[PDB]
Symmetry: C2
């Protein structure tokens, strides 16, 4: 006993799960990298201030 | 001179971090762009 769009909804669930998990991974990578860039910016700004 | 060598080593370290962070940024930019085109194509095949 199957709905007329059951297979299509299951395919949608599969694709959605994968795409959203990739999205979370890329958000996390982006977060880590922004934090590193901020550390680097603080470091360079402070070293610039003391160079003269 | 010791202070000059230490200075240059720190300078070199900082320039290296700049290069690595730019490489990482460029790569993640491409990854994000590619993912976005996947999501847009996904979304349009439904509607």
């Amino acid at each position: 006993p199957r709905g007329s769009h059951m297979e299509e909804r299951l395919a949608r669930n599969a694709l959605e799960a994968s795409v959203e998990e990739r999205t979370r991974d890329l958000r996390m990578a982006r977060d880590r990298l922004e934090t590193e860039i901020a550390d680097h910016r603080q470091t360079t700004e402070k070293l610039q201030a003391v160079q003269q």
